[PDB]
């Protein structure tokens, strides 16, 4: 065995563990989610596991979807000098075209044999795994300050008397047993002798700190396009209440969509409809209020 | 132009520090390191007025 604990400022190591674990957790959660936002009229007719596509797109490798046996299996694809042949690395096994491939972008609208590359972002300047590191430390220390604020927001009622058995019988039989009408000696024995340590310099501070945590989440959120935007259009709470500057959050949402524009180039080739929409739906009540067809009653209940 | 001057000059000096005040060499540095920016509540100090609006 080996044991000799520090003190009870162990909490001052537990506090910094909460901050450190919060940064690690929020960082890898936020990129645990971020490669699924778009999902684009999900599997109309096309054999793509779009989850495996979007995970590949957020490590910035240019995937290439084409035909394999007329059914659109993904492949990897790493002034205008045109690409034609299957020179690139190919991830499937025997489903390779073994024939004339092409990029279907500008050779014509809708004619050439399909192997179209899809960028994550049309013009690439900085990776957004750096922006997610940029705010999560700032977010980490505001989560530190919230946790440190509510950890010292606890309150005792200090009794103050010369020690051995004068005031103990008082609080036992007449405060925590709830008793009104306790009788005492005239020796100033509650003339502000019992005192309260309060932290009312802490609870007005508490709510404003939560609002700073909240709008910093929103200021990370609208950067990476994930937004509450369309419902904010129909709710009429459009500007300076949701302090987000709508023209910037509809801006950063749109760059990721027109990065995945070459799926429309593919969609024009084989005669089908694939639009890169932007997912904001969460179900069992939204699907109920949009239909209210009695077959949807036998589906849910 | 000069009202844009006054806005830029106003937000350029709107930045804020928390001044510690003590006789210098290694009394209060260990304080702020292990107990303010590391977020720690319950820092214990000497009775020598050492935060009585110090």
């Amino acid at each position: 065995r080996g044991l000799n604990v520090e003190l009870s400022k162990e909490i001052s190591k537990r506090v910094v563990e909460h901050r450190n674990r919060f940064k690690r957790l929020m960082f890898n959660r936020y990129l645990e989610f971020l490669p699924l936002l778009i999902n684009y009229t999900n599997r109309d007719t096309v054999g793509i596991d779009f989850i495996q596509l979007e995970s590949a797109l957020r490590q910035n490798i240019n995937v290439v979807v084409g035909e394999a046996r007329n059914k659109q299996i993904m492949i990897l694809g790493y002034q205008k000098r045109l690409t034609k042949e299957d020179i690139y690395f190919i991830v499937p096994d025997y489903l390779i075209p073994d024939d004339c491939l092409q990029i279907h972008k500008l050779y014509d609208n809708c004619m050439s044999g399909n192997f179209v590359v899809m960028q994550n972002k049309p013009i690439q300047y900085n990776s957004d795994i750096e922006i997610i590191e940029h705010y999560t430390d700032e977010l980490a220390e505001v989560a530190l300050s919230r946790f440190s604020l509510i950890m010292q927001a606890k309150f005792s009622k200090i009794f103050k008397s010369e020690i051995n058995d004068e005031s103990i019988n008082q609080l036992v039989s007449e405060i925590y047993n709830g008793a009104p009408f306790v009788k005492m000696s005239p020796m100033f024995n509650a003339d502000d002798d019992i005192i309260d340590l309060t932290s009312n310099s802490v609870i007005p501070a508490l709510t404003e700190m939560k609002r700073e945590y909240q709008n910093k989440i929103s200021e990370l959120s609208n950067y990476l396009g994930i937004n509450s935007l369309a419902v904010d259009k129909e709710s009429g709470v459009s500007d300076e209440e949701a302090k987000s500057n709508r023209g910037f959050t509809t801006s950063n949402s749109n760059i990721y969509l027109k990065g995945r524009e070459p799926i429309t180039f593919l969609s024009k080739r084989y005669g089908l409809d694939i639009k890169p929409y932007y997912d904001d739906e969460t179900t069992s009540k939204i699907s109920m209020v949009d239909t209210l067809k009695d077959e949807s009653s036998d589906i849910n209940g | 132009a000069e009202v844009a001057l006054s806005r830029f000059s106003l937000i350029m000096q709107a930045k804020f520090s928390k001044i510690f005040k003590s006789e210098i060499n290694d009394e209060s540095i260990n304080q702020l390191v292990s107990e303010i920016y590391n977020g720690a509540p319950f820092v214990k100090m000497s009775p020598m007025f050492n935060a009585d609006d110090d």
């Binding site: 080996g2 000799n4 604990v5 520090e6 190591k13 | 290694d26």
Partner: peptide, 27 residues
């Protein structure tokens, strides 16, 4: 976790580092 100083012992080494700080003694 739960950082403990499980040894708590006695020493036999001696010190008067004729120096301004830890730093200047390292120098």
């Amino acid at each position: 976790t739960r950082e403990r100083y499980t040894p708590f012992y006695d020493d036999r080494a001696d010190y008067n580092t004729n120096s301004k700080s830890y730093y200047d003694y390292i120098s």
